[PDB]
Design a protein around this nucleic acid. Structure first.
Ligand SMILES: CN1CN([C@@H]2O[C@H](COP(=O)(O)OP(=O)(O)OP(=O)(O)O)[C@@H](O)[C@H]2O)c2nc(N)[nH]c(=O)c21
Ligand SMILES: [Mg+2]
Lengths: 47, 731, 60, 160, 189
RNA sequence: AGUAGUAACAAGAGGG
RNA sequence: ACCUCUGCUUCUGC
């Protein structure tokens, strides 16, 4: 359920998932960078 | 990780169309576009598959197949192609690719399979460890009932299963609402543990968990045990003319066992009351009966069920009883007084006639419980006052409601907001009025009232709320404390007629108090008894009795002619007596024996079909009566069937064309104008006659005289010429 | 059970001819309005739509 | 033997047999009588106190809860945007899309009843615009009448 | 109110990070070596917001709040309600500490004057950082005031509908038994 | 011709 | 004369 666009929903999921991944040990910083960065590119390309 | 998915997304968003779609499609609207298709549901899949399986590449597979398996196999077969399936990026492949993968593909480990697919694997386990008895051949009515079809469920609603599955498979997507129940939480823990690291598709996990957790049912013709482990193998255990005795591997629910114990005990009690020596007969049946090959005696020794029939059996066996019954999960023990069962009609708040039993009389009740207790008082549909205690206010709540329901008051009757299921089968009234007021007290509490209780610095109060109040409460409701010696099992004695008394000689239980409800056992009962038909059930009492008469007809006929009273008293007719309403047994007997004597007296008017039909009704000390009967009532599963004295009925009819007697729709084989055994003290001569005056009812033949012939609406639209006989026949 | 022993009982094995071709949208409009008597007008009008559309239908 | 009228909106010839003359033979007849129907329904209400009210309250609850996507369930559906049959979901998608392009989008709520609102409001449009693929793609403007006739259309086929 | 509240929220977090070791820090670059101190929850669509809440609670085994908070702090591991009010920081706090009674949420009210109020008059945010918010609020109330709109703003902080539009109404009128002139007459009958 | 049976198939569509 | 595509997709409801 949601009024959010499919894209905004996916971006917010990726961000939070990458954070918990990091502060659980599952993911390194040089991934967590790559994701949050990719997210911001998508963010801008959306613009 | 989440590495490659975001890269993909990045990729997609570079494309303008996809970006438009992704930016202008809400999450809600995704539901629509997800099903957007040019492909239609195949209308004839059987034909289409036969056609396509002739083709080189009928299967559609993910494009990644192309990197996962060789294009050709050792034998020269092409296994995949680059042709896109219409509407996707899947590609067209050969069935040879499926076999290839199955011989030479990536091997996975399957540790989770048994756990994810437990519902299915459990079926096999129960079969692998099942035991077969022999096959018996007989005709038995299979009555269509809603039954459970999936053993090992957790009795969750679809809401609660959803909530649990969300926590197990998709915990971060749960949203606001999290799990109330401790049942939910303990299931979640277990499943989380069993299915950790699981790499099977979460679609299959969720699908399986949902199938497994929710109780599912179905309407099926079923003659025997209705438990789900039996339903599961109905195809194997039950045929049109046969039973394959069988016991599934694994343990029964305590709930199924308890339920069956009650049914067995009631059947035994009801059969025993009609014997010359009830206690002797009950003891015999107790000592031969088994449930799933467990002796009933052992079950009765070790089972805590407190129920009237169960307690009669326990008394007979020298087992100590708790003279209590359960209602809504709480044990009730009446302290003082008593009341009366009464059948009367009740307009509920739904605006509905619903005419089940009332309790009418003074009754003090001590009520134990899980975490709660109370001192309910009850008159006639009255809550004289209920003082409730417990660990939590919560535990005082459940029981609080239960007790208002139990009261039978008009304030809960006219407060509900049907009496049957959809198949129009009657349901449990004083348990469903509980279920309703369970999840919605609202109306009840604000339609119950309140009370201004004195300062008496001890007896608190509960309001039309759940709130606690100082010197107010609900109408007759209190909150105090009190309530070990409730559970103490006492030594009792029992007389020849099943009356149970304490060591001081006080009447605790009488057979007439035993519920008349004819239930269906969840587990197989074998009486192993000469006092019970081999085939269980009321319908089978009917078919078996008539089948037995017919097959023994030569003997029984000569006994009818030479030695009637021995025939009437034969033991094979006692089960059938339990189908006849208690109050009618004697008059029905009297009527029957008189008709049989008239048949003897008026020579050449023998009729074997009439004798067979009426014979079971002879088996009770007869009483004198004036009453003429056009039918006898039998009670079959709570519903009167009427067997017509004259000719065929739905219950019992002779079919000329087949030359068979049909009883509730089952063949039980086969063996002048004057009818000697239809009216007592009259003969039917033949067709009515206008030249003998107008048409009387039966109940107006009253004042005719020897030799005097009338016209009678005798039954089923017929009018016949009768004659009041000149002599009489005595019994 | 509800009958007396003196009554005849017959069963019609029954089929309706031209069911689809003889039921009428206007009649179903009446049924819906009657069934929903006393209910909120928005709901009544909502349910009445289908019958009204059927009264005004055309076939390809 | 009923009454003919011309529909103001579609121009359709419309036959009304209701409260018409009573059947005169055993041939199939459509001369149903409103007052007789209402008597039967009232008789049924009497025989089932509270049934209509409850069934109505359950329907109201459903109206509130039901999502647009409920309409994705179904088989072949006449698609007025194509004047052709399509799977239900595709037909739904097409209607939603053409609606929003013509300014009807209460259904963005995601609730079915808002789509129903859109449907009725769509009939006020002077000129519903759709696109054909010429025999390529091309904008077509339907007259109010064209659109209404399509909205009220049943597609027909033979039963195999 | 919605734009205002959400601006404060955004200011509260933007340009605020955590190290490789893990000490609160401020920065103007806002960049792939550090990590945001705060999760911003406000502005997210409700379902997504709850997704974020749940994800965090599952990582910490923090209990889940009854209400949707505005932020979460990865340093103090608290959820945060922001408030903005024309009336009294004094009273609007205890208005919300009510709403959130039993919860475990740092509250942080801000008035348009400047003066603020947090939990246990204890601040998890720095002075420079709160300065900006307090300032921004006043400068907004200034832009509100000289626009004519502060006096307006400082005084705020259904049955289902379904009817027939004209065409469908006309169709309804023509779907009746023959004696009736219109749908409303028929419905009354 | 044949299949069929109240209307169809007995190749269709597109390019050149 | 060749080339290409197609074998439920202008036609299957509740
Ligand atoms: C409402 N009840 C319940 N009850 C006793 O509790 C028993 C169990 O209640 P129930 O749920 O109706 O079960 P039961 O009657 O066994 O069901 P069935 O006979 O249909 O199988 C009843 O048979 C009855 O003896 C009561 N006993 C007394 N004295 N007064 C009451 O008001 C009530
Ligand atoms: Mg028909």
């Amino acid at each position: 359920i949601g009024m959010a666009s499919m894209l905004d929903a996916m971006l917010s999921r990726a961000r939070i998932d990458a954070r918990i991944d990091l502060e659980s040990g599952r993911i390194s910083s040089q991934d967590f960078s790559e994701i949050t960065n990719t997210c911001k590119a998508i963010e801008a390309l959306k613009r | 990780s989440g590495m490659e998915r975001i890269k993909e997304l990045m990729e997609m968003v570079k494309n303008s169309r996809m970006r438009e779609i992704l930016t202008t499609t809400s999450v809600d609207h995704m539901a629509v576009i997800k099903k957007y298709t040019s492909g239609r549901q195949e209308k004839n899949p059987a034909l289409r598959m036969k056609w396509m399986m002739a083709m080189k590449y009928p299967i559609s597979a993910s494009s990644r197949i192309r990197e996962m398996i060789p294009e050709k196999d050792e034998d020269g077969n092409t296994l995949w192609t680059n042709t896109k399936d219409a509407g996707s990026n899947r590609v067209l492949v050969s069935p040879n690719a499926v076999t290839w993968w199955n011989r030479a593909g990536p091997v996975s480990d399957v540790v989770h399979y048994p756990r994810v697919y437990k519902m299915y694997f459990d079926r096999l386990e129960r079969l692998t460890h099942g035991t077969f008895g022999p096959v018996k051949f007989y005709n038995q009515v299979k009555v269509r009932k809603r039954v459970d079809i999936n053993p090992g469920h957790k009795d969750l609603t679809s809401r609660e299963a959803q909530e649990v599955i969300m926590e197990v498979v998709f915990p971060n997507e749960v949203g606001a609402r999290t799990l109330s129940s401790d049942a939910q939480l303990t299931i979640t823990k277990e499943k989380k543990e069993e299915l950790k690291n699981c790499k099977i598709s979460p679609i299959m996990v969720a699908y399986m968990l949902e199938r497994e957790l929710v109780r599912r049912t179905r309407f099926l013709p079923i003659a025997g045990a209705t438990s789900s482990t039996y339903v599961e193998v109905l195809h194997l255990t039950q045929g049109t003319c046969w039973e394959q005795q069988y016991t599934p591997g694994g343990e029964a629910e305590n709930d199924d066992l308890d339920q069956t114990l009650i049914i067995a005990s009631r059947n035994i009690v009801r059969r025993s009351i009609v014997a010359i020596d009830p206690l002797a007969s009950l003891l015999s049946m107790c000592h031969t009966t088994s449930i799933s090959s467990e002796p009933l005696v052992e079950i009765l020794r070790s089972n805590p069920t407190d129920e009237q029939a169960v307690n009669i059996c326990k008394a007979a066996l020298g087992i100590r009883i708790n003279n209590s019954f359960s209602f809504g999960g709480y044990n009730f023990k009446r302290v003082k007084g008593s009341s009366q069962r009464t059948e009367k009609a009740v307009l509920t708040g739904n605006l509905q006639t619903l005419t089940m039993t009332i309790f009418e009389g003074y009754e003090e009740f001590n009520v134990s419980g899980k975490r709660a207790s109370a001192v309910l008082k009850k008159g006639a549909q009255r809550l004289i006052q209920a003082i409730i205690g417990g660990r939590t206010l919560e535990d005082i709540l459940n029981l609080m409601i239960t007790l208002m329901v139990f009261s039978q008051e008009e304030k809960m009757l006219k407060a509900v907001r049907n009496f049957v299921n959809r198949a129009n089968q009657r349901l449990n009234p004083m348990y469903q009025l509980l279920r309703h007021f369970q999840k919605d007290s609202s109306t009840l509490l604000k339609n119950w009232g309140t009370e201004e209780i004195d300062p008496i610095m001890g007896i608190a109060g509960i309001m039309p709320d759940g709130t606690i109040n100082k010197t107010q409460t609900l109408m007759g409701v209190r909150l105090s404390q009190g309530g070990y010696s409730f559970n103490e099992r006492i030594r009792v004695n029992i007389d020849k007629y099943l009356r149970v008394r304490n060591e001081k000689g006080e009447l605790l239980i009488s057979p007439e108090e035993v519920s008349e409800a004819q239930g269906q056992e969840k587990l197989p009962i074998n009486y192993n008894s000469s006092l019970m038909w081999e085939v269980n059930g009321p319908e089978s009492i009917l078919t078996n009795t008539y089948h037995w008469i017919i097959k023994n007809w030569e003997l029984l006929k000569t006994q009818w002619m030479t030695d009637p009273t021995v025939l009437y008293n034969r033991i094979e007719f006692e089960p059938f007596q339990t189908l006849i309403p208690k109050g009618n047994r004697a008059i029905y007997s009297g009527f029957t024996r008189t008709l049989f004597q008239q048949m003897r007296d008026v020579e050449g008017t023998f009729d074997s079909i009439q004798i067979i039909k009426l014979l079971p009704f002879s088996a009770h000390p007869p009483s004198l009566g004036r009453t003429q009967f056009s039918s006898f009532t039998l009670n079959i599963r709570g519903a009167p069937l009427r067997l017509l004295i004259r000719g065929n009925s739905q219950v019992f009819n002779y079919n000329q064309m087949e030359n068979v007697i049909i009883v509730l729709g089952k063949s039980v084989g086969s063996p002048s104008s004057i009818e000697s055994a239809v009216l007592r003290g009259f003969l039917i001569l033949g067709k009515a006659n206008s030249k003998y005056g107008p048409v009387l009812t039966i109940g107006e033949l009253d004042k005719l005289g020897r030799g005097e012939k009338a016209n009678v609406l005798i039954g089923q639209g017929d009018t016949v010429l009768v004659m009041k006989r000149k002599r009489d026949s005595s019994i | 059970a509800k009958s007396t022993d003196e009554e005849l009982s017959y069963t019609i094995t029954g089929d309706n001819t031209k069911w689809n071709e003889n039921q009428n949208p206007r009649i179903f409009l009446a049924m819906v309005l009657r069934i929903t008597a006393g209910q909120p007008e928005w709901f009544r009008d909502l349910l009445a739509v289908a019958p009204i559309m059927f009264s005004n239908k055309v076939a390809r | 033997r009923g009454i003919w009228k011309t529909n103001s909106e579609t121009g359709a010839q419309q036959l009304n047999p209701i409260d018409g003359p009573l059947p005169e033979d055993n041939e199939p007849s459509g001369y149903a009588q409103t007052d007789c129907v209402l008597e039967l329904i009232e008789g049924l209400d009497r025989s089932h106190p509270g049934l209509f009210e409850t069934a109505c309250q359950e329907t109201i609850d459903a109206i509130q809860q039901t999502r647009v996507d409920k309409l994705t369930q179904g088989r072949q559906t006449y698609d007025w945007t194509l004047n052709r049959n399509q799977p239900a979901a595709t037909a739904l998608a097409n209607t939603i899309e053409v609606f929003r392009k013509n300014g009807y989008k209460l259904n963005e709520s995601g609730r079915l009843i808002d789509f129903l609102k859109d449907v009725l409001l769509s009939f006020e449009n002077d000129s519903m615009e759709v696109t054909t693929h010429f025999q390529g793609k091309k904008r077509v403007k339907l007259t109010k009448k064209n659109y209404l006739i399509r909205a009220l259309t049943l597609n027909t086929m033979t039963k195999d | 109110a919605i734009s205002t509240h959400m601006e404060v929220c955004f200011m509260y977090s933007d340009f605020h990070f955590i190290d490789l070791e893990g000490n609160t820090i401020v920065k103007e670059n806002d960049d792939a070596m550090l990590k945001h101190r705060f999760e911003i929850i406000e502005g997210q669509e409700r379902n997504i917001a709850w997704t974020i809440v749940n994800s965090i609670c599952n990582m910490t085994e923090n209990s889940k709040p009854r209400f949707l908070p505005d932020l979460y702090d990865y340093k103090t591991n608290k959820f945060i309600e922001i408030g903005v009010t024309r009336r009294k920081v004094e009273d609007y706090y205890y208005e919300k500490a009510s709403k959130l009674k039993g919860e475990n949420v740092y509250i942080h009210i801000f008035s348009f004057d400047g003066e603020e109020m947090a939990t246990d008059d204890e601040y998890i945010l720095d002075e420079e950082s709160r300065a900006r918010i307090k300032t921004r609020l006043f400068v907004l109330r200034q832009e509100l005031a000289t626009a004519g709109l502060w006096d307006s703003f400082r005084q705020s902080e259904l049955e289902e509908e379904f009817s027939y539009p004209p065409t469908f109404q006309r169709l309804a009128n023509q779907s009746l038994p023959p004696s009736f002139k219109d749908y409303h007459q028929f419905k009354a009958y």
